[PDB]
Design a protein around this nucleic acid. Sequence first.
RNA 1: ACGUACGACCAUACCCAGUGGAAAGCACGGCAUCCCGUCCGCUCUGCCCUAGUUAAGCCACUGAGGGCCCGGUUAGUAGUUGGGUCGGUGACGACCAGCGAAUCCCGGGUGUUGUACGU
Lengths: 141, 88, 571, 239, 275
Amino acid sequence: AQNPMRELRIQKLVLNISGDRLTRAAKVLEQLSGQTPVYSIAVHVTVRGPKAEEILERGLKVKEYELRRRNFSETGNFGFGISEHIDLGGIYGMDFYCCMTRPGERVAKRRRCKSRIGASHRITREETIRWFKQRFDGIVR
Amino acid sequence: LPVTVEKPTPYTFDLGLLLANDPNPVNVPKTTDTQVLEQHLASVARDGAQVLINQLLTTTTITATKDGVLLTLPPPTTPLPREKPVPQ
Amino acid sequence: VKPPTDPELAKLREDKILPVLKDLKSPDAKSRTTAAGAIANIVQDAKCRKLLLREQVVHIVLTETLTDNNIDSRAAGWEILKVLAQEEEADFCVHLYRLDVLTAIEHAAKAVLETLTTSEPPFSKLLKAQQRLVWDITGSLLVLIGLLALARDEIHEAVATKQTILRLLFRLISADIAPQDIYEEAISCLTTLSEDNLKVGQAITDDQETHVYDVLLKLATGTDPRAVMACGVLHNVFTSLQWMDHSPGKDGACDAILIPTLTRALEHVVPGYANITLLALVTLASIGTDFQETLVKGNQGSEMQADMERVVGADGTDDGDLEDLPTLRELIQTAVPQLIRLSNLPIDSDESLTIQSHALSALNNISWTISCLEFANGENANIHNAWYPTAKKIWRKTILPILEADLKLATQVTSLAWAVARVLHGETPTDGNPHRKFISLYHSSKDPFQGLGVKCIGVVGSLAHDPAPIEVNREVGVFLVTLLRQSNNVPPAEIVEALNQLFDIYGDEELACDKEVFWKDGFLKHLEEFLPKMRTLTKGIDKRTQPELRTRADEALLNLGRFVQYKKKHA
Amino acid sequence: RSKRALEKRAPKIVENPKTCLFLRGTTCSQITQDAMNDLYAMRQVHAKRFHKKNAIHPFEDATSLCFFSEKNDCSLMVFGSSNKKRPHTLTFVRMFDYKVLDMLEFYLDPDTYRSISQFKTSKIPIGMRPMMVFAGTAFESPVPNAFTMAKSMLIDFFRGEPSDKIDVEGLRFVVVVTADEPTSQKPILRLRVYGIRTKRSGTRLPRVEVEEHGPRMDFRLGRMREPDPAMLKEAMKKA
Amino acid sequence: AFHKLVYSRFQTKFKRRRQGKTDYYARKRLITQAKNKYNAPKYRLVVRFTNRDIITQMVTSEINGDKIFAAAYSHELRAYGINHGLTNWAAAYATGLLLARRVLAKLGLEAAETERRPFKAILDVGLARTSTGARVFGVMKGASDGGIFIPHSENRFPGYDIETEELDTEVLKKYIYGGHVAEYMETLADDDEERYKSQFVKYIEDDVEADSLEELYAEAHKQIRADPFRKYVSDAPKKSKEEWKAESLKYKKAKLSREERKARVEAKIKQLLAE
RNA sequence: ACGUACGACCAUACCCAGUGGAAAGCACGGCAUCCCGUCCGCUCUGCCCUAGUUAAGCCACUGAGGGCCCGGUUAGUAGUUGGGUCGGUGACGACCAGCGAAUCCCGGGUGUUGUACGU
């Protein structure tokens, strides 16, 4: 049947903004994420933990809980973009890219006994779509 | 059970490579049973190794901090080829 | 130089070969020169030249006539040997090589170079008969060294080894005071010698005694009429020295500089001399073929997450140009519309038929070279943006009126249309339903990968590959499934390419064609029925004859199993 | 990083130990693979292996051997091959300045061959060089012949790393190669590996006892390509 | 998404590299270093950390490949008094001390040919990262304090500054007797209540505290130096391994034999070829 | 027999797709004070084996699966030595020796094994 150890989980939420303009945008990512962003032409920061779902919830609050079908990738990750950062809280356009993992991802990234994750445990597109419909009560069209 | 063996030809030992050329002809029984061939070959090898470490222990040793008694070896005298020749 | 006996026992006696051989063996130079014309006329005829080779005339010429101190007997011997070379095939050239004609040919080249290069008599004050005999000698040297270069690969290497003959070619093409036939033969022999030869290109670009590369570059840059015959030689130099867009040599050594003058040659062609146009089209097709390994040698000398973030974020845009590949810029901007204009000429002349055939060949080469580049998921975007409206122009101007109307011409336009449809990917202008014309061509059609039906299957797969009017995709899918059910009367290459096109068309489930065409027509049942029959026929293919077809059919079977499992899972 | 590699690749006055190379032919019986496995186990520190089944013949053309020796810095090669004419062959090649100096062929008898795994004692530790004893009349010949060449390459195989000081806690293993006297049939060379267990029945010196492990090989020497005197005179010299 | 296009020229790696358990480059570097250029074998001390356990053998390299001299595990420390946290630094030092005592007891430190030599070793860390403060150096410190001689520096010990070469021996002596766990328990007890109960459950129910942990580890070390050959039984020791052999055989999914393979081929012919 | 650690042969062990795994061990997992390292406790390092879960890793089995391997064969052939004898103006072909492949085909296989500690 189903296991509690195969439930979906947000892994990360990378935020990316594309001389002086990068310097100004680095402070915006620093005040939004709370961490120091890194350069590449473009700046980006990686956000994990319980604040990542808060940032993604605010980003879905910008797009009023509606996302297109073409945005959900076939790997399982999904992303979108907002052209103005003012309504989150010079106009800056930034995109939100989010990755989905189950428990047991560490078997692909550890040093000792690195292995491939199984075929029945890999995340698919339709499960991500069902998760999106279930949690935030958003409609995919 | 003696600790030395006397053969008609003297051994030609070369301690630089831990070597002992033996010019005394080995008498192969040439029998169908391989077992007696194995004990004859092992006896010849036993005599060779006995002469080898007897000539090794004849050479002076020195105890060391590494805690291993070391046997000083002469430089190698057997001619051998070379990987790459002498520069300049 | 063994004195073997001559067993003359032919049914037809040598009534005239014996006096010709006696006159050739005579010590008189004028008699030998007079008999050279008769011997050449006899050698031009068939069924009697073999009797002259039974006389061992070639050894008598080689060790006695060509070794004579008088230059006239040497000229007659070289005329005899060049006539015998022109009449007979390359095994004669191998026979000359095994008698060491290369040492004598280099000695004669050095002697004639010493007589022509000297300014002490000088060469200019000589009589017209003497200089005419000298130029006839050099013509014999050039035609013989060209045929020996065309004989075999090791003979080509041995000719490229000798420096004196290359110096003679450099002095001949740099002095340019010879008559036009000798200069043209020197150009042709440098063309044949420069193909895939590092040594010839190095000697061309490294000469400072005459600076031959400077003269060739100056000629190729200008509007000199014969200069286009030189240009491909430089192209062969740029084929040999790896002087291309990724790493140019002296003065930005790329083929793009060679482009416009040849294009200017295309400006010299008018609707309603032809060797110049044919050589220009051959050189352009050569550039178009060589641009493929130019690309792979350019490429020879995390990211997936970034590509997914770019694709999913809907941030796709078009910018930039082909600044890193200027040869492609000069080909697309100038050469492609000129070949389009040249292809659509009136067909009132057979010369125009040959010109149109070579133009379609050049367009086929450049279109296949461009279309083999991967444009999936927006990679190499600027090249696609440059090529796309010109590719639609090629489809509108060339493919449709030719297809409105020869098996060879149909094969060429099918290959060109496949090359265009591989990069258009369903954005082809559907005017007058060209896929129905392709279906009619394939039905009228009735080593294995170059058939007409294979290219017809390939083009009708690509036209509906991506979103395009559902009815075109419906007709293509019905045709492909009808081909797959009746697999008894088709070659396996057609089956392999039809399966590959069926994988590429109906792959993902996001498209409307998967819901509207694939599941409504029940193609999965036909594929599941087809799987054991295609397993039997791919077990029927021998491996030692066509290993490529066997490997591609095994790949087709594995991908068919994966595809039917995918469509069973995704419903 | 490549500076130390170039320094190791450079010729040096005091020679480093030679890196052997084991490579396999197109056809190879299981006996020849087991023999190369045993020899590679006994030369485990200074060796390299190729699992790519290279299609070369060492006696006809030696260009591929020169290419492999310049690419991998290998001055000693063991090539295993199998034919209907010659059932199990191991050819030993010594090369000098990336050109072939000496080659020899050993024909192995498959009926009397025993691997290391079939003896069940304590084995030799990795990298400890064994003592050598060469008992036989055939090794002492005035003219340079086959058995002197076999001695001159089995010494180079089993020498390992030279040292002028050797602790007594080694010296526990002997490699015994023996050749019959040159009499019809060609003489048979024999390679045995033995371990030394000391029993002190004598008052002063210990008495050896011999226990067998390792390969049990019966070679017959075959084809040969002797070195040229020009390479021999210049590579036999001493610094 | 499709077109698996292939690869008979693809050559696999070794068995213990596809599983990712051994790096053969570091293994070759370790066995070459150990030779000493004298022809003397050197024993290398391996240490591997699982979750819940510490595995410490002391291996030597052979042709068949390896011979365990003496193996010390973290399980039998439950026989010496310590029962909670058998993975931390203090258990690592205890396992190193137990391993050194075991290898020095079974060495004895009838016709030997050597005609009081302390023991020698080489540290093996495996695929574990060799950062400072890592418990591989705890096992190494336990071995080097137990009586064997390991060539080592104080660079990788914890409580060691990096911009000056001073080792705070108070911090090291705190980690030997598990003082970091003690002060962590004190901090979690004072400034928290949920985590100090969520963790340290077996510490709570067995009624141990900071100074009790320190004296208990000291008594454990004295017990290790007293009699290092105890035995432990934990859960369910059904002995007489033939019983375990029968139990494993009657839960093993057996294969199909050659007659059964012929029967399966006949069934496949009747089901697919003959439908 | 099964499990771990360390290994030896290094695809019979890999690749894809299905079904199952008692005991213990492996894992997954929990936490971020200290040692330590990051854009991010993701990896690395430290603390807890309590709560969970065999979903994946791992192991086992299945598949007219792809691949791979062993034995017999294809061959002392092709090819090569233009190395030697006869033809052939030649190109080259017969002939005699030495060296000497591979697919196809037929039969079988899908891991053996060492030390230590356990269930």
